[PDB]
């Protein structure tokens with residue numbers, strides 16, 4: 548289904564799980580990909596009410612269905628924690644500056 552709506556992008560729960568699984572694996576192997584060194588810390592400056600606990604890590608989710616491998620990140624991110632719990636799916640689309648809004 549279109550479980551999450553990130554601006555004009557639609558993600559299924561399976562899209563979110565595959566993206567999360569890939570970010571976590573890299574987090575746990577101590578490796579990073581891309582210019583922005585993904586997965587990195589998501590600081591929660593927006594102050595979202597994530598049910599799960601901090602430190603939070605952000606990883607790009609691609610609208611194409613491709614899993615992120617170091618290229619252009621895009622607007623959308625999966626946010627997970629240290630226990631691989633999903634905190635949320637966020638996007639820079641619809642937010643001003645370099646801020647994020649939550650995907651609905």
Ligand SMILES: Nc1nc2c(ncn2[C@@H]2O[C@H](CO)[C@@H](O)[C@H]2OP(=O)(O)O)c(=O)[nH]1
Pocket residue numbers: 583588589590591592593605624645646647
């Ligand atoms: N808006 C925002 N950006 C964060 C936070 N933690 C890390 N960032 C990263 O810092 C940049 C803002 O300078 C954002 O584009 C973002 O990187 P990503 O682009 O890699 O998502 C945070 O909580 N809030």
